[PDB]
Design a protein around this ligand. Structure first.
Ligand code: ZN
Lengths: 72, 123
């Protein structure tokens, strides 16, 4: 027997393309003229994600991308 | 001592490469500074982002961590090791680095001694 093609489905299921963001570190910190630094993003309460691993400021929740911890 | 001040950083950077104690890039450097596992930092004077410089300087100052200035980012990257060696021996492929953090020192007395003396002279 020979293989039939039958090439017809939903036109194209596209693959997710990751967003390109330039200098994402900067928006985590706010700066005053005096030289102070304030951390805009919350720090996760988990063990590993404690100091430099910031959370996600979603419109209705806080989300840590490293351990899937979520808060209201 | 015999080695120059500006050329004595190569030994420390090579030994940190070998012992895997380098944080490269602004994001890794900032995360290491927040983790305060850093020992010293290396900054590139030649840059087009004043906010980059302010953030690195303030993070170094507010974590009482010594900071070093380098001429250009491409030489910084060549020291760092993000390069490939040609048949003749020159690094045709160089990707520059703007900030570096040394997490673990290499077990070298001579390399650390000159940098510590320079930091004490600065203070
Ligand atoms: Zn977490």
């Amino acid at each position: 027997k020979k293989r039939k093609k039958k090439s017809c489905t939903t036109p194209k299921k596209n693959k997710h393309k990751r967003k390109k963001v330039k200098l994402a570190v900067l928006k985590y910190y706010k700066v005053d003229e005096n030289g102070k630094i304030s951390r805009l993003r919350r720090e996760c309460p988990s063990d590993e994600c404690g100091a430099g691993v910031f959370m996600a400021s979603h419109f209705d929740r806080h989300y840590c991308g490293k351990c899937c911890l979520t808060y209201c | 001592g015999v080695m120059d001040v500006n050329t004595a950083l190569q030994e420390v950077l090579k030994t940190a490469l070998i012992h895997d104690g380098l944080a490269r890039g602004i994001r890794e450097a900032a995360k290491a500074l927040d983790k305060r596992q850093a020992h010293l930092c290396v900054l590139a004077s030649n840059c087009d982002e004043p906010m980059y410089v302010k953030l690195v300087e303030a993070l170094c100052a507010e974590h009482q961590i010594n900071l070093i200035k380098v001429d250009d980012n491409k030489k910084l990257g060549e020291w760092v090791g993000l390069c490939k060696i040609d048949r003749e021996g020159k690094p045709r492929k160089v990707v520059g680095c703007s900030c570096v953090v040394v997490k673990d020192y290499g077990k070298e007395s001579q390399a650390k001694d000159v940098i510590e003396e320079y930091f004490k002279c600065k203070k």
